[PDB]
Every structure is written in C-alpha cells, then in structure tokens.
Amino acid sequence: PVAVQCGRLFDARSGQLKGPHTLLVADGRIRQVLPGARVVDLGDKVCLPGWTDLHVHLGSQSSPQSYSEDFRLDPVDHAFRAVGYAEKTLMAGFTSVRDLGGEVSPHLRDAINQGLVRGPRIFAAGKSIATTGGHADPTNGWNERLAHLVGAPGPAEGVVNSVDEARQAVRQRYKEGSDLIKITATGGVLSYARSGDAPQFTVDEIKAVVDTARDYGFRVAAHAHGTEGMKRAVQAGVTSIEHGTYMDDEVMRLMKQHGTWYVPTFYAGRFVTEKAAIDGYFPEVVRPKAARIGALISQTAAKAYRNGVRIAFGTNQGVGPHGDNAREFVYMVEAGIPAAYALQAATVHAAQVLGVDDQGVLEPGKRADVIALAGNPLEDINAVLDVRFVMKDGVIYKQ
C-alpha cells in the first residue's frame, strides 16, 4: 500500500480543481479519497489522472526515409524501436493509448502486460481494413512485378470488396488478437495513391463490418477526410471518426443525432504543414495532398466544438515524434476549446470512447493511474509539458 498526498486534485467528472487530498492505493486500485503505509509527498504539484491518447502508431515514426524503409526493414527492427517509443510515451504522462494500425503493437502490448518492457496500457486494432486501392491497402504503389509475386491481397490481409469478405476480415482480426476494428472510409494524404477524399466503402460493407464487430464486442474507428465517406461511416454506426477534415453541417447533425465521437488530431495536421517549407521531404504523389488537407483541421474542429459535437483526445503520433503528445493540449486551447474540456477529453471522454469503466477518474475501485504537474494548466496550458510524477496500476515509474 501507499498514501499519495496531492496538493491540488482535478475532478475529471466535474471539471473543477479541488483542494488538498490524500489518495490510498492498494492492489493497484484506488480505495479512498479523503480531503485534507508509505507517504509520497506531492503537496507542491497538481495531482491528475493519467492521460489517454486515442490515436497513436507506436510501431513507426515518420522521417525523410519512411517510404524507403518498407522494403529493407524487418518487424524486429520496428519492435526494437517501439521499446523506446513506448517508454517515451509513458514518461510523457500517457498511461493508456489506442493503437490504430500496425502488426507489432499487439506483441508490444503482450510484452508490456507481462512486465518485459515498460510502457502504457495499449488497446490495439491490428491490421486496418480497406478495399482494393484503399488508403490502407498494403501493396499500394508497388511495381507490377512485386504485385504479381505477392498476389492480390484478400480478407486475411485486410482488403475486402463485399459483405462476406468484410465479415471474414473482422473474424480474422479477432483471431489475431485485436481489441477493436479500424477501417479507412476515404482516401488519405500520406499513402501512395491518387485520391484523398473519395468514398471507398459502400454503406452495406460498413454495416457488415459494424454488425460483425458487435458480435465480438468490438468498436469501430473510421478514418475519413471527405464528406461522403464520413457520412456513410456515420450512418452505418461507427463509434468514432478520425480527422474529419471536410465535415459539413449535415455530417455534424448526423453525428450529434447518432452520438458519434470526433477525434481531430491537431498535431498531425500542424506537423505535415510545417514539413512543407522543407524542399525534399515527401514523394511527389503525397506532397500536394499533404499541402492541401493539413491545417484545415483546426477550423473544422473549432466549428464542431461550437456546434456541439463530442470531441475526444487524439494526436496521430507516429507522424509526429513520440513523447511529444501533450502539445495537442496547447493546440486545442489555441483553437478556442477551454482548458478544462481539453483535460476532460483525455480522461473521462477517452474512457467512454474505449468502452471501459475502471479508468479516467480518481474514484474508489478505479485503477491507480496518477500523474502530477509542476504548474497549473487551467491558467497556463503550457504546464502540461512538465510532468513530475507518473504512476500506473499502483507502480511508480517517475518520481
């Protein structure tokens, strides 16, 4: 057991900063919250619940050589890099993440759960599900020789073109040990393809995916830049929409009526626009899309917040450098979202998005994921960049 003494306590359920409190931690869970057994003295720090990043890619990090290192590097090298990526993420203050694509992440989650390596609690989607020529198609851009040798991808590889193939793909992801399902409803900006906002799924295919995923207890996250694919995904019944660059009034109304969550990923847009002044960074097929679609997310997210769409915290890390996830708070506040709502989007709304109930608040019976900051973010949001204390499941990783 251990008694943690917070100087100030942030109530995520309400959104207010309370006074001094003492946390009682035993068996990895919070047992008591008394206002005013080892002692951890944090009377000088603001004492917060652990953050959750709902959009990360722990198996990669963008670089000038990213597109070339897909035919030379093996998954073991990616696994060796993911160790440092995960340690940096956990030390930045994020005790839980949702991985939205990649085959190394389930193995990293299993290794972290066994105590082999240090990192956050990972909810992994595994392989993304796409159509032929879609944003997540694994053989996009290959020359005809390589495509001929490797064959046309199918449901086992995540590429579907009918209802039965979608059902088989969801079952294949369940077989491989996934926690949720990720689909690419439209085209993207970083893939080796032409379109970036065209509808790539039919409504029937998305409905089949959602219906199959509901049987296995999964939730579905949909990547969407264009309006028609976003509308189709929202009407089919997905749980969250990522990016959503070209959201309009009708999509906003449908999302409000359906209770869909929106994850904007400010950081990815800002990073890809800043990496445009640099002359050689992107292939000639990707650079126009990256110049066009980026940095239009900020206005869309501000409009969505003003219109009443529920917003949750996500960064799309793996485009940006791991361990720098907290600058998304500063980006969110700069766009007009209040600091308290920005902090709630990472604790209580993130738990709602994940579909769990044992995390997000410092209440009895919940997991003991506690962090502390030197300053107060409610007045200066830059205080999120200095984390002094990190605890996860009752184990202290940074003191």
Ligand X SMILES: C[C@@H]1Cc2c(Cl)cc(C(=O)N[C@@H](Cc3ccccc3)C(=O)O)c(O)c2C(=O)O1
Q: What is the smallest separation between the CB atom of 261 and its own copies, expressed in angstroms?
A: 25
> Closest CB to its own copies among 169 and 361?
169
> Closest CB to ligand X among 301 and 370?
301
Q: What is the smallest separation between the CB atom of 136 and its own copies, expressed in angstroms?
A: 13
Site string for Zn ion, 238-257 (x = CB under 5 A): ----x---------------
Out of 189, 224, 351, 391, the only residue in the binding site for ligand X (CB under 6 A) is: 189
Instruction: Note whether 343 and 395 are within 8 A (CB).
Output: no
Q: What is the smallest separation between the CB atom of 167 and its own copies, expressed in angstroms?
A: 6
Judged by CB under 8 A, does residue 132 bind its own copies? yes
> Closest CB to ligand X among 103 and 358?
103
Site string for ligand X, 73-102 (x = CB under 6 A): ----------------------------xx
Interaction residues for its own copies, span 112-131 (CB under 8 A): 116-117, 131
Interaction residues for ligand X, span 122-181 (CB under 6 A): 128, 136
Q: Across the chain, where does the E strand assignment appear?
A: 2-11, 16-17, 21-26, 29-35, 38-49, 51-56, 94-99, 121-124, 181-184, 220-224, 240-243, 261-263, 370-373, 387-392, 395-398
Interaction residues for its own copies, span 195-254 (CB under 8 A): 195, 198-200, 202, 215-217
Judged by CB under 6 A, does residue 269 bind ligand X? yes
Backbone angle region of 155, left / alpha / beta, with phi > 0 → left and psi within -120 to 50 → alpha: alpha
Instruction: Note whether 172 and 119 are within 8 A (CB).
Output: no
DSSP strand pairing (370-373 vs 16-17): unpaired
Structure tokens that stand for 142 in this block? 């290959």
Residue 290, class by beta-carbon neighbours within 10 Å (0-12 exposed, 13-18 middle, 19+ buried)?
A: buried
Instruction: Note whether 205 and 167 are within 8 A (CB).
Output: no
The DSSP string of 96-152 is EEEE-S-SSHHHHHHHHHTTSS---EEEE--S-BB-TT-TT-TTTT--HHHHHHH--
Q: Which residues bind its own copies (CB under 8 A)?
A: 71-77, 79-81, 83-84, 104, 107-108, 110-111, 116-117, 131-134, 137, 140-146, 149-150, 152, 154-156, 161-162, 164-165, 167-168, 171-172, 174-175, 177, 192-195, 198-200, 202, 215-217
Q: Which residues bind ligand X (CB under 6 A)?
A: 57, 59-60, 101-102, 128, 136, 188-190, 223, 243, 265, 268-269, 272, 294, 297, 316, 318-319
